[PDB]
Amino acid sequence: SNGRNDTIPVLLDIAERTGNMREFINSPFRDIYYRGQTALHIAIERRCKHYVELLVAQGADVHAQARGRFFQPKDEGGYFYFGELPLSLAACTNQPHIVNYLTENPHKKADMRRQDSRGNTVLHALVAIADNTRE
Amino acid sequence: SNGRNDTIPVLLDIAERTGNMREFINSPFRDIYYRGQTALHIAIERRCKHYVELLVAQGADVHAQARGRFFQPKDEGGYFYFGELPLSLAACTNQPHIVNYLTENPHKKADMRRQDSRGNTVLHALVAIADNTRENTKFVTKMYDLLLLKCARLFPDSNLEAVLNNDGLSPLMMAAKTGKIGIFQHIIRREVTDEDTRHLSRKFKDWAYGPVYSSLYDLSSLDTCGEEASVLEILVYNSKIENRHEMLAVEPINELLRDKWRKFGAVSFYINVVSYLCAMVIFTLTAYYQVDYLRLAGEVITLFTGVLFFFTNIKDLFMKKCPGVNSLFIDGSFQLLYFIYSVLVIVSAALYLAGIEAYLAVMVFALVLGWMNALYFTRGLKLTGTYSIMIQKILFKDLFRFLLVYLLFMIGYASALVSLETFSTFLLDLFKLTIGMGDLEMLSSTKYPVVFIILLVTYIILTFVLLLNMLIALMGETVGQVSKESKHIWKLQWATTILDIERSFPVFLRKAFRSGEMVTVGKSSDGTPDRRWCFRVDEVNWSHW
Amino acid sequence: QKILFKDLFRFLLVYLLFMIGYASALVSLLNPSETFSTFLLDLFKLTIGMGDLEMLSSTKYPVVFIILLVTYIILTFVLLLNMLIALMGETVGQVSKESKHIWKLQWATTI
Numbered sequence: 133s134n135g136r137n138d139t140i141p142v143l144l145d146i147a148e149r150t151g152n153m154r155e156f157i158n159s160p161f162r163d164i165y166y167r168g169q170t171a172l173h174i175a176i177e178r179r180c181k182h183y184v185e186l187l188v189a190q191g192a193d194v195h196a197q198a199r200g201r202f203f204q205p206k207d208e209g210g211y212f213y214f215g216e217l218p219l220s221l222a223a224c225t226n227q228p229h230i231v232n233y234l235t236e237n238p239h240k241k242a243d244m245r246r247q248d249s250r251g252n253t254v255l256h257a258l259v260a261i262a263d264n265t266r267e
Numbered sequence: 268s269n270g271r272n273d274t275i276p277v278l279l280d281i282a283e284r285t286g287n288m289r290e291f292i293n294s295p296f297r298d299i300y301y302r303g304q305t306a307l308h309i310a311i312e313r314r315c316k317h318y319v320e321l322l323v324a325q326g327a328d329v330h331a332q333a334r335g336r337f338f339q340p341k342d343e344g345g346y347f348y349f350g351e352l353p354l355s356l357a358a359c360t361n362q363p364h365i366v367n368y369l370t371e372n373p374h375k376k377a378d379m380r381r382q383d384s385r386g387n388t389v390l391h392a393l394v395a396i397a398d399n400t401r402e403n404t405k406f407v408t409k410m411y412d413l414l415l416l417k418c419a420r421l422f423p424d425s426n427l428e429a430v431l432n433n434d435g436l437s438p439l440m441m442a443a444k445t446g447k448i449g450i451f452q453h454i455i456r457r458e459v460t461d462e463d464t465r466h467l468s469r470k471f472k473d474w475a476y477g478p479v480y481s482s483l484y485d486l487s488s489l490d491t492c493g494e495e496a497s498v499l500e501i502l503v504y505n506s507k508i509e510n511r512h513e514m515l516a517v518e519p520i521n522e523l524l525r526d527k528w529r530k531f532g533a534v535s536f537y538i539n540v541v542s543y544l545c546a547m548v549i550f551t552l553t554a555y556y557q558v559d560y561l562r563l564a565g566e567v568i569t570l571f572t573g574v575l576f577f578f579t580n581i582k583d584l585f586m587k588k589c590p591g592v593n594s595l596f597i598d599g600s601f602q603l604l605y606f607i608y609s610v611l612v613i614v615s616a617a618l619y620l621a622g623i624e625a626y627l628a629v630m631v632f633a634l635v636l637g638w639m640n641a642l643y644f645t646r647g648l649k650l651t652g653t654y655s656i657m658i659q660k661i662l663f664k665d666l667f668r669f670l671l672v673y674l675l676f677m678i679g680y681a682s683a684l685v686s687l688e689t690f691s692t693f694l695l696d697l698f699k700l701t702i703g704m705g706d707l708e709m710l711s712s713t714k715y716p717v718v719f720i721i722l723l724v725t726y727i728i729l730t731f732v733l734l735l736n737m738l739i740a741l742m743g744e745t746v747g748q749v750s751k752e753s754k755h756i757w758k759l760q761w762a763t764t765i766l767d768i769e770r771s772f773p774v775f776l777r778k779a780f781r782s783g784e785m786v787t788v789g790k791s792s793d794g795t796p797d798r799r800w801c802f803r804v805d806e807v808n809w810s811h812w
Numbered sequence: 813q814k815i816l817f818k819d820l821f822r823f824l825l826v827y828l829l830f831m832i833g834y835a836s837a838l839v840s841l842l843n844p845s846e847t848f849s850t851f852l853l854d855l856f857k858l859t860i861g862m863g864d865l866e867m868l869s870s871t872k873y874p875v876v877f878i879i880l881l882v883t884y885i886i887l888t889f890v891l892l893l894n895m896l897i898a899l900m901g902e903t904v905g906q907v908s909k910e911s912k913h914i915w916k917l918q919w920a921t922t923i
């Protein structure tokens with residue numbers, strides 16, 4: 133709410149003492165509709181640059197796959213197909229700052245050449261999301 | 268003058284000296300035109316704030332009923348209807364400061380729930396004054412919001428919009444029936460984001476994932492399973508036809524009609540059509556034989572269909588009926604055809620039992636009118652609905668007044684031509700001649716071989732060329748302008764068919780096929796969830812994030 | 813092809829519907845079985861005006877039969893000709909640009 137939530141820093145502070153920091157920021161939702169969507173996907177689609185920076189600073193993942201039925205083309209019975217990668221999600225939601233940060237960061241960067249399950253790269257996803265409008 | 272006269276405070280001082288201040292500043296004009304307009308109404312309508320504050324300071328009256336004939340709707344013979352309250356008058360003249368002050372003031376305040384002699388609240392008055400213009404709809408919607416929110420903050424109870432007038436109409440159905448796109452559309456997709464006053468909204472934000480926004484429209488009054496007054500039935504039946512199309516094309520209504528179609532509407536119609544075609548085939552087979560037991564069963568089936576149509580047409584009298592439905596193509600035009608076909612069938616049966624030999628003529632007329640009736644069921648597709656609308660327009664035009672007076676023109680010119688029982692014979696001969704199957708043998712018996720020659724040439728000219736040209740030009744004028752209202756009245760016909768199918772179902776069947784879904788859209792007093800029958804409409808927008 | 817698809821089927825459907833209904837109604841006034849083909853042929857001939865009305869006098873009631881024939885002729889001819897003319901005019905005044913756009917497609921296809 134209101135662009136910030138102070139709980140996450142304390143939650144990560146607890147998690148690192150629990151000794152599961154690599155496993156903590158990872159959540160392949162067993163549900164069919166939300167299969168593979170980790171916390172980085174949520175942080176990116178919420179347009180929260182600071183939280184994306186924080187989560188990638190802990191070194192979780194930059195190549196997580198959003199394989200759920202929700203994350204499928206409308207022809208297959210989905211609602212939003214952006215590719216299946218956090219970089220593809222950032223590119224398909226019009227977040228240039230997130231794309232820039234994910235491409236050039238010290239911790240871990242997602243290569244633009246990576247292909248999802250369908251083989252689509254970031255540009256294939258950008259083509260898929262585009263409709264013949266102006267904005 | 269110049270916004271201030273200094274005589275008012277002095278006169279009020281004299282009045283308070285005289286000890287009649289309650290009766291001094293109160294002016295129930297006994298004139299029939301101004302029956303009730305007190306000084307507060309005059310102060311407010313002059314766009315003056317300091318004087319209205321000054322007069323209301325001593326507490327004269329704030330709920331004065333301006334029952335005058337001048338303060339009545341233009342349809343009743345007035346010139347300005349604003350409700351009948353100073354608060355409603357201030358709200359109907361775009362005076363946000365006056366309406367603000369009249370509510371949050373120490374001395375005396377006007378409750379927004381108060382109703383005039385018509386039962387109209389201030390929101391009803393705002394709906395009544397609104398028309399379909401930008402500079403009007405702007406402040407009407409803005410101050411309708413303002414008033415709804417203000418009545419929501421104070422009195423944490425049922426919203427002001429839930430108060431019905433003496434006709435049972437809330438502002439929503441009042442706007443739907445009277446035909447205002449502005450306030451009606453604003454109410455339909457009303458979204459309030461404040462936490463305290465959130466239950467007032469009618470369009471929610473169920474879920475969102477980047478550039479996809481699944482909004483959740485409310486169907487509190489749009490779709491009611493019979494046991495309430497509904498906006499949709501009023502829109503389709505009781506509204507201003509001049510402006511009915513633009514209000515059936517709003518966000519929930521059109522997709523709600525499509526959902527009803529897909530659910531039961533389209534499939535009821537196909538069951539409804541195939542049955543009528545089968546009945547028409549059975550009736551044709553029965554007529555072709557006029558085995559006798561089988562054709563008697565077919566005749567019984569035909570009589571059953573005829574009596575069903577007769578009961579359907581008669582039962583409408585005790586229901587929504589008696590408009591000027593003689594020219595409307597919203598199933599009003601086909602309703603008279605239904606009734607005529609049923610009456611022909613019934614009269615044929617009666618003459619079949621009364622011994623009159625003219626039974627078969629009426630029965631065959633019933634069969635042919637029944638096939639022209641089977642032409643009705645092409646409303647299921649726009650490509651065929653437009654064709655049906657055009658062909659029915661021509662049938663409702665071609666055979667009527669101009670063709671009728673064309674027959675009368677034949678009558679008159681036959682009467683003029685005869686003899687410068689022979690009248691009827693010459694009439695038949697001329698009728699055959701005009702089509703081309705007649706003969707010119709009448710020239711021999713003419714007493715004047717001159718005059719008639721040129722006269723017959725002129726008669727042929729007018730009867731054939733002129734009438735054919737004007738008849739063709741009739742559809743020539745129609746088509747170019749009606750290319751769009753063809754589909755407009757097609758939409759009206761489709762919606763009317765869906766709603767008429769829906770009514771015939773029992774209440775439990777309507778609830779079984781009820782559209783939308785129950786959603787907990789928020790919290791209320793005592794933590795009770797808002798269980799509103801809502802209608803999801805998924806959307807997409809790459810402009811706001 | 814556009815006229816054959818969208819318009820020819822509707823015209824034929826309406827024409828056959830009216831013809832079958834009215835022909836069955838007229839046969840309902842028969843006097844004795846196999847007269848279906850001959851009666852349909854004579855009605856079709858009378859539609860343009862080349863037919864014979866010899867069988868008309870054999871019916872019991874001449875007035876209603878003649879009136880119904882007149883209604884058949886006027887309604888079918890006027891309505892069907894008017895709908896043909898109106899639909900073709902509207903099509904050629906509306907989708908000429910769409911046909912222009914289309915022709916390019918099979919031109920490129922042929923290439």
Ligand SMILES: Cc1nc(C)c(-c2csc(Nc3ccc(C(=O)N4[C@@H]5CC[C@H]4CN(c4ncc(C(F)(F)F)cn4)C5)cn3)n2)s1
Binds near residue numbers: 531536598767
């Ligand atoms: C201009 C007009 N004036 C009047 C008075 C009109 C009028 C009134 S009733 C009527 N014509 C009727 C009446 C009754 C029925 C009928 O038995 N039904 C309806 C609803 C349930 C049941 C089966 N059906 C159906 N249910 C689900 C599907 C699914 F599988 F797709 F889900 C498919 N089909 C349709 C059909 N048609 N016409 S019309």
